[PDB]
Q: What sequence folds into this?
């Protein structure tokens, strides 16, 4: 299948500006060029242009509900279009709120997909439980069937249709969960591997586990929503919500490497890369480079090396 | 049981001043306020005032024997009082020599306790084996029954009564043991997991192993003596004897997290935090924050998150 | 068996000068003195003097073929002399091209040896596959029987006799392999554990694996060829080709400690320590100390501690 890059330069999902420069930063680092050197046909769709909704009064505590809901509906339509044509979508964030459009779109064409959410957070706060307005912390609430109607309808999200059930999502790398979120994942019986489970089992046993939970009964396409903060701030410092005690660069690459091997990766997001949040330029390069490394790993790049078949060396 | 904070700002246990500022620094980071947010009643006893013994001539190579012995006698009495009232004592060091008073006190009330010593060192040098006078490196020698009389009586420690035998202590994180100490732990048959076993088994199997060694025959109260240098200098740099190749922040929190789950934590020490040894202020903050995080983990804080029961979110 | 230190201050194996100062740096750090404190007799043979071959025109893309070929022949002779006398040779590089002489020499006296190559790279490019002239990235191509005649005869290497077959070498720590090298290791069926396998199995299971592969059928002397870049750049930054995502200091010491326990260590190389490549002096000290620590570990130094037997402490 070919790969289609889609930039989502949107940052109204959280309080600080910056994530909109994520797509630019990743491209400037040669992400598309590097991708072209793999056994995949790469088409770069370019960055979506989001029309800013005027007089976007907060719902209640929820902020920018219309701009976010609109931007997502727009993104969902695009993602649905490429998936339709049989291509693998890669969304360059942009903050996590944009995972609503990405997974929705993807689900329109692939209704039986599962989601592997790699993050330091669950991002499952409903507009009620949220302690801030911020929508980047609420993606999964708007996507879960089991949470349908457990909160008021938000302006701009009328189009949203809960596509995944609690049995289709696995979390990896949790270490910063709110009481409400914790209550929800505990109540609904959601599967997760927080840093304490990664510490106990090892990333090898962790991936083995997630694949038999998700793919044990039957094979289905996978959507990997990757948040750069799921790794330790020492590796990906330039994000808005860094939390020490994260996954290591190695563990990061092991996750993506294992995913490639299933041959089921259908959708992928690289979110939260905030170019303006690094103390020094080296921190921006460090974050960007690991974000790219993660991407190429999903598409065949192995640490043991790679070589073009049919070519005879020697 | 309630929790009682007891500050032991003592530094005569070793050659450099500074560890006396450990309690002040931990407090300033909000250690007590944060503890209060847990499902525990927190009472802060304050910092003990130690009277300096005049003309404290070295025993032999042993330094400040009277000031260290006196200070511990004082601390042992306090710890015994609180343990007697059914509370959990938390001693904020201060150097390791103060572990003599802490464990003694705890043992007068709970004679069947076991000790889990997390440190890069065994701190088991007798006044004979020591290559320096420093008592901070001799705590366990004064507490072991099997070492009673294998060395001369030291001034200021007449009150000491060997409370634990070689089968009641487990070491975790060893990577800097002296020949003599190595001789002792090898001879006496002491159980330990140096960095090489942590590397071979993994922290999960390590904790699993210590719990069945210590609690396999019968449950008994646990005294966790935690030396901040048991973790890698990259995480807790502000100590006097850092040794590269340590336990990681995650490994540290996994230790504390497992301990909480036994529900047997009865005594806890957070030793060696020397605010004056960080090259830059960030190093002090880093050491202090991880010391605090370890403390809260012991009292319930989980990485997967926590939530107040009886409260309904949604 | 005694130990014989042999310095190979050579750097024509790669484009940058610097590795010739490796032996100097290692010695200045007290490597020989520290070695003398082990249960081994240490003789320091000193540094080899290499005569520079005039008018050393590039073979094809291959650079300095004569200087490197000669230097190795000289080193092979010395190594064979000490091996003959029943000693364990320790070669202090110097770049990896000097592994050609080291292993060859050792193989003349011990034709049944196996090689454990710890490195970020396979260093198996033939003069054809190389994308640069650099011989430091070609050692193994000149030593494998299975690659004999798969490339033109290079000037200065006529004396070389392929000594090890594809079943006698195991790689550990791979994370930067070229397409050709990857083609070769995949084709010839060479056993390896790249970073991804280390991540999956853990270093304990990895060493257990290499020992049964290599020593399962019958015991034979081991040649440990250790390249300082097999550890992460955070521990050994002063090398020419650093690659993030490496083995940790702990993982490093576990390798060496396991090798000592076999009692089969017959030859050892400590290569690539480039004193002139550290940003700050602390980076040089860091690289050098871990190289030293690795060496002592091979010769008995344990993390749990060591003590002289027959001596009674207490
Ligand atoms: Mn996140
Ligand atoms: Mn210590
Ligand atoms: Mn290398």
A:
């Amino acid at each position: 299948k070919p790969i289609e890059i889609i930039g989502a330069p949107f940052s109204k999902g959280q309080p600080r500006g910056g994530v909109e420069k994520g797509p630019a930063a990743l491209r400037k680092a040669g992400l598309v060029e590097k991708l072209k050197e793999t056994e995949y046909n790469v088409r770069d769709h370019g960055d979506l242009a989001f029309v800013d909704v005027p007089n976007d009064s907060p719902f209640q505590i929820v902020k920018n509900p219309r701009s976010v809901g609109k931007a997502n509906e727009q993104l969902a339509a695009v993602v649905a279009e490429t998936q339709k044509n049989g291509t693998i979508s890669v969304v360059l964030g942009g903050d996590n709120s944009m995972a609503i459009g990405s997974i929705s779109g993807h689900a329109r064409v692939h209704p039986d997909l599962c989601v592997i959410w790699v993050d330091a957070h669950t991002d499952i706060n409903t507009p009620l439980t949220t302690s801030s307005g911020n929508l980047h912390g609420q993606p999964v609430a708007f996507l879960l069937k089991e949470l349908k109607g457990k909160f008021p309808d938000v302006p701009g999200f009328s189009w949203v249709t809960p596509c995944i059930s609690a049995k289709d999502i696995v979390y990896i790398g949790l270490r910063d969960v709110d009481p409400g979120e914790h209550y929800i994942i505990k109540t609904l019986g959601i599967k997760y591997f927080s840093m304490t489970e990664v510490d106990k089992l090892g990333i090898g046993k962790v991936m083995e586990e997630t694949f038999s939970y998700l793919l044990g009964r039957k094979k289905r396409p996978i959507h990997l929503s990757f948040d750069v903060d799921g790794l330790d701030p020492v590796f990906t410092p330039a994000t808005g919500t860094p939390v020490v005690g994260g996954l290591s660069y190695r563990e990061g690459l092991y996750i993506t490497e294992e995913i490639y091997k299933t041959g089921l990766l259908s959708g992928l997001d690289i979110m939260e890369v905030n170019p303006t949040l690094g103390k020094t330029p080296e921190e921006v390069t460090r974050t960007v480079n690991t974000a790219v490394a993660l991407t190429l790993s999903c598409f065949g790049t192995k640490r043991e090396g790679n070589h073009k078949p049919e070519t005879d060396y020697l």
